[PDB]
Amino acid sequence: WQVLGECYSKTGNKVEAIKCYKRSIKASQTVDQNTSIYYRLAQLYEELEDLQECKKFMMKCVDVEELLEGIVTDETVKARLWLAIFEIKAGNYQLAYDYAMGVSSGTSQEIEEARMLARECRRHM
Amino acid sequence: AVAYATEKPISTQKWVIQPLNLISVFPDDTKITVKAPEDIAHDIVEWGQFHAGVSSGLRISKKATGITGSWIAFNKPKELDAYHGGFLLGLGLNGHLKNLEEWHIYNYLSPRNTHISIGLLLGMSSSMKGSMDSKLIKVISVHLVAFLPSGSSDLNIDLKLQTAGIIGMGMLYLNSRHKRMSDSIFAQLVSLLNVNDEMVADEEYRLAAGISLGLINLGAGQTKVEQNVMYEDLTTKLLEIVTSTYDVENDWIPENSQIGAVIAIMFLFLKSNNFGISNMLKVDLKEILKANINTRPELLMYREWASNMILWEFIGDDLSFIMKDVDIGVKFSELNTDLLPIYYTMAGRILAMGIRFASTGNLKIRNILLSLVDKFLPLYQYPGKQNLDFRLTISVINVLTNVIVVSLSMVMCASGDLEVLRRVKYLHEVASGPYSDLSDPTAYLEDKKDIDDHYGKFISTNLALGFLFLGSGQYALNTSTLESIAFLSMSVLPTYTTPHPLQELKHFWSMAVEPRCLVIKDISTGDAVNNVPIELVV
Amino acid sequence: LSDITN
Amino acid sequence: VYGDRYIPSRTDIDFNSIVSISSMVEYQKERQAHETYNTLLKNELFGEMLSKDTVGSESSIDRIKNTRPEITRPSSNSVRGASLLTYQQRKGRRLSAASLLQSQFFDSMSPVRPDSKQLLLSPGKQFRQIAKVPYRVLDAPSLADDFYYSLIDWSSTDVLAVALGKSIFLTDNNTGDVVHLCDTENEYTSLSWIGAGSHLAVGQANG
Amino acid sequence: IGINKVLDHLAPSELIKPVKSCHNKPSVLVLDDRIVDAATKDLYVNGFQQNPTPENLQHMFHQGIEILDSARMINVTHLALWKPSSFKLGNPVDFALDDNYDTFWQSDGGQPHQLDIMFSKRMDICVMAIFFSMIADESYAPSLVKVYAGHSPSDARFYKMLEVRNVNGWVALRFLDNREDDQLLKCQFIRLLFPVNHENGKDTHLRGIRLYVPSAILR
């Protein structure tokens, strides 16, 4: 099912690819394996320009990191950075500050992006 | 400049680049063909090929679609040369290289050829233009030797390639206001560099470092919280470099860094109207002419240029502003070196005046420049009494006459003026110089200086000719957005003297070019109707 | 003496 | 956590990408300088596929060097190299531990990958043979040039005896001058010393 | 009208250009010390004279230094930055500027040897002093010298030619062609070239070099 979603995504059929990934999620036996699908599924919603809808899937992909005793994987690093950026636009600086600190153990560009975001929200905190 | 957005691509259709012809035809019709490298310096011919390739690449319209990463590979000549490197720069210069796939980036960069690497870095960086993407900045980080981790074994990277990398690097960080990179850039400018396992000082690179730093922090000087403190520290450091007077030359702060510091303090407070900073940057002729003066005289042109642009409200349109506080004040009216600072004074003043009134057109400004060019044209390239004080002065006149012609074309851009075209025509034609009318390596160098002088004389008139007819006259320069002035000021950087530092940057006004010609067409017939009065609200 | 000529 | 054999997962690296990756006296020094630059460039520009791949230890530089088409210790012995499809790789990450925050810290000051930094910091071999033009030449006019002749001879006291024409000259390396011993009517052909430079046995052209 | 008249004064063209009939060949200066002339005596200090012994060369080396320093003059040889084309790890330019005949500087590298003299502030050089030793250093003797001028490494330009035949003494070169009114040279950048040595030499020494510029109490 996941491969079908990639084929639909690469052929410009985003409307169909959403239902394809959703079917794949149910078939997965363990919640851990849904980390990769959640982040990609959220990007397609951003391509469909409904930012409110993609928030719910963004919550789940970040929350699997907590359920896995801090897995700290790559595809959740981009999740926290994107989630923190939107939260700045929402005006909730306190709710965005903890996201930057939790992702302070990623790649070289990942840490600096959250570090500068941390300083910005800290000043307005 | 003549062809900005004329030709459109078909994607399927294969592009073609016309090779340099460089064969001259005389009215006697006895054709003489130049061949390299016996007749000319070897570097010149493919440098011209690179310039032509850039023009061919830039000829594609901005709004053209279908130019993906596969298309450039489809047009690859299967043998890398200067033409394709220029062509690669052109597409990236037009914003087509937004996301070039990583497959053939290596294929291009695998040979150590400088031209293709230079074209790739500058064009690709100019395409993204401030996206701060990691997968790209790391490539220049590898290229730049100094930013490479210390203690690593040196890998052979050409110095011109390092200059190309740093400017494309700085432009990648446009409006980033990133401290961790800005301080590294600043420390890079002052510090000395390693080439061929021996320490070397380069004016071209330090100029490249200066323009880079100014561009990264463009528009960051309008400050009236630690960012303000860090900018003041950076500002007072730059003022220290530009104003420090050393009786004995320090090795690691030579005068070569002065131009880079001035261009950086320029871009820091561009369009800020800070009277103070302009004052320690503006230089008073009455005081300096009394004194012996210090530092390279060429600094004065940049300093006064920077000071005038700081005050982006008082750029005088009259000859008084150009001729403010100038007098020979000496009995010896013969061309002597003591009156060089005045020539750099006017050159900086007229150029800032030209940039200020860019593409808006005017009559009083045009007439003033016409009078000035009419006065200064006769002395141009006149080696009568071969005296070094005389020769150095007339070289400055050669620089001075190049700036005014460029500034005159700049203010009257996209108009196709007549008298301006006539003046740039004469400067274009007729070599003049010591030859015509008006120990072997030593003779080679003696000739090479003259050929380089002719090359410097030709780039200015060629740039002016292109500016007069920009995009077939339907495109004009933009000076409204803040960075448009930055790229415009950057591209018109007068580097006409040897060794023509940072020449490849001359093809960068294209960011300031936008469609500014309005014409009327009929609907039913579909043909143009002209000569109808148009009312405008401004 | 060095400086050997060709 | 382990992918099936019959249904392998596809890495982001493409058919022609491996074609790119696998592509390869002062001349030797320049060639070595060019090769490390090329290896560093292809290592840094690529490696996102290689970073997603691998199971433990090893490096992306080792993977590139293993692609077929004074040395420090190699980590691991895997020679898998580039590959279109991977079986072992199922997305999994180790929990953050103090070593990881130490590692991400020494990475914070590095503008390039740690593996590339290690490759560059590694010392290239300084193993060359210098057999070039002489660094010193002295004067000895009118030297014999007969096939049956052997004139110059080393002595332990930095002393050279030469048969220049029909006279025996003495060159001292410690002083760099020339000293004349004697001369005779018949030219010399062979030179020798006996003991510890005390005596000089010389053969003439008549025996 | 003041603006119009001053513009003419800065850049006179019709008044200046007489015929524009320059010969454009490089002027060559004769350095031989066998002919006695007033002009040569001005540029050659030690006096016209078998080859003197090295100690006699050392003696005349000191007397030449004393005579050059005897007149009212200011020495600023140590007030500038120096960067030769290449070293040889035996003697840097310090022993060339040490004012000692025994010690000297040697380059080692490409045949067109370059000697760079960079200045920090606009200094007006009037007399340039250089010492040659034809008999003492015939192997590495400078045979042809070309002196440049300019305000920067960018704008270096040819000034004068110098041909060496036999000069075992200090050589003084005051500058008059560039500016007749000032009788001195005004530049911030001076570089020297040694494209070829005597009897087809390879490298070149420099025994001495100096730069000359003009200008009750309680202890």
Q: What is the DSSP string of A74-120?
A: HHHHHHHHHHHHHHHHTT-HHHHHHHHHHTTTS-HHHHHHHHHHHHH
Domains of chain E, first to last: 1-213 (2.60.120.260)
Element (H, E) at B513: strand B513-515
Tell me the two tokens of residue D153.
């001879």
SS3 sequence, B247-300?
A: CCCCCCCCCCHHHHHHHHHHHHCCCCCCHHHHHHHCCCHHHHHHCCCECCCHHH
Q: Which residues are CB-neighbours of B88 under 8 A, at least 6 positions away?
A: B53, B57, B72, B108, B116, B119, B120, B123
A107 alpha carbon, distance to own chain's centre: 16
- The Cα of C1 is separated from the nearest Cα of chain D by a number of Å equal to 5
Tokens read off for B69 = 């990463």
**Which chains have 3+ CB pairs within 8 A of B?**
D, E
Q: Which of D132, D135, D137, D139 to mutate to test the interface with C (most CBs of C within 10 A)?
A: D137
Establish whether chain D is in contact with chain C, requiring a minimum of 3 CB pairs below 8 angstroms. Answer: yes
Cross-strand pairs, E89: none
Contact partners of D by the rule of 3+ C-beta pairs under 8 A?
Answer: A, B, C
- Do A75 and D91 count as a contact with CB atoms less than 8 A apart? yes
For D9, the token pair is 């997962």
**Which phi and psi angles does B379 have, rounded to 5°?**
-70, -10
Question: How many residues make up chain C in this entry?
Answer: 6
Q: Do the chains contact at D110 and B156, CB–CB below 8 Å?
A: no
Rounded to the nearest 5°, which phi and psi values hold at E160?
Answer: -150, 160
CA–CA gap between residue B294 and residue B354 (Å, rounded):
28
Q: Does D99 touch chain A (CB under 8 A)?
A: no
Q: Are B256 and B203 in contact (CB under 8 A)?
A: yes
Search chain E and give the residue with CA nearest B448. Answer: E157
The dihedral through the CA atoms of B256, B260, B265, B266 has a sign that is positive
- Measured in degrees and rounded to the nearest 5, phi and psi for residue B33 equal -105, 130
Helix (H, G, I), strand (E, B) or coil at B199: strand
Q: Which amino acid is at B519?
A: V
* Angle formed by the axes of helices D15-22 and B102-109, nearest 10°: 20
Question: How far does the CA of residue A32 sit from the closest CA of chain D (Å)?
Answer: 9
Task: Please name the residues in contact with D132: beta carbons below 8 A apart, sequence gap of 6 or more.
Answer: none
Cα(D173)–Cα(D188) distance, integer angstroms:
22
d(CA B178, CA B92) in angstroms, rounded, equals 24
DSSP 8-state assignment for residue A21: H
Contact A58, A103 (CB under 8 A): no
Check CB contact under 8 Å for C5 and E203. no
Q: CA A125 to CA A97: how far, in whole Å?
A: 9
DSSP secondary structure letter of residue B166: H
Give the pair of three-digit tokens for residue B391: 């020769």
- For residue E119, report the phi and psi dihedrals to the nearest 5 degrees: -115, 150
Of A74, A75, A105, the CB nearest to D104: A105
The tokens of B257 are what?
A: 């860094």
d(CA B264, CA B302): 11
Give every CB contact of residue B189 below 8 A, 6+ residues apart in sequence.
B206, B209, B210, B213, B257, B260, B261, B264
Residues of A in contact with D99 (CB under 8 A): none
Q: Say how far apart CA B517 and CA B473 lie, in whole Å.
A: 8
Separation of first and last alpha carbons in chain C: 15
B378 and E24 within 8 Å at the Cβ level: the answer is: no
- Which of D21, D39, D43, D45 to probe by mutation at the B interface, max B CB count within 10 Å? D45
Cα nearest neighbour of C1 on chain E: E139
Find chain D residues with C-beta within 8 A of C2's C-beta. 136-137
Minimal CA–CA distance to B125: which of B160, B106, B163, B98? B98
DSSP letter for each residue of B321-344: HHTTT----SS--S--GGGHHHHH
Cis bond upstream, residue E92 (ω within 30): no
A114 C-beta neighbours (distance < 10 Å), count = 23
Residue closest to A114 by CA, chosen among D185, A88, B474 = A88
Identity of residue B245: T
Which residue of chain A has the CA closest to D113? Answer: A108
User: Contact E206/E194 with Cβ under 8 angstroms?
Assistant: no
DSSP sequence for chain E: -HHHHHHHHHS--TTT-S------PPPEEE--SSS--HHHHHHB-S----PPPHHHHHHHHHHHHHHHHHSS-EE-TTSEEEEES---SS--TTTTSS--SS--EE--SSSSEEEEEEESB--EE-EEEEE--TTTTSTT-EEEEEEEEBSSSTT-EEEEEEE-SS--SEEEEE--SS-TTT-SEE-SEEEEEEEEETTS-S--EE-EEEEEE------
Structure tokens at B170: 């700085």
Question: Hey, is B521 helix, strand or coil?
Answer: strand
Tokens coding B162: 């390092």
State the DSSP H helix or E strand holding residue B408, giving kind and residue range, or none if neither.
helix B388-411
The per-residue DSSP string of B114-157 comes to HHHHHHHHHHHHHHH-S---HHHHHHHHHH-TTTSPTTPPP---
- Tell how far CA A37 is from the center of its chain: 10
d(CA D181, CA D197): 14
Q: Is B444 helix (H, G, I), strand (E, B) or coil?
A: helix
Within 13 A of B25's CA, how many CA atoms are on the CB side?
2
* Other beta carbons within 10 Å of B244: 13
Report the residue from D45, D111, D116 with minimal CB separation from B106. D45
Strands E113-119 and E80-84, by their bridges, are: antiparallel
Give the burial class of B44: count Cβ atoms within 10 A of its Cβ; 0-12 exposed, 13-18 middle, 19 or more buried.
middle
How many CB atoms lie under 10 A from the CB of residue D195?
A: 7
SS3 assignment, position D9:
strand
State the method.
Answer: cryo-EM
Partners of E146 on chain B (C-beta within 8 Å) are 442
DSSP B177: -
Local structure of residue D165 (DSSP, 8 states): T
CA distance E215 to chain C (A): 44
Environment class of residue B300 by beta-carbon count within 10 Å: exposed (0-12), middle (13-18) or buried (19+)? buried
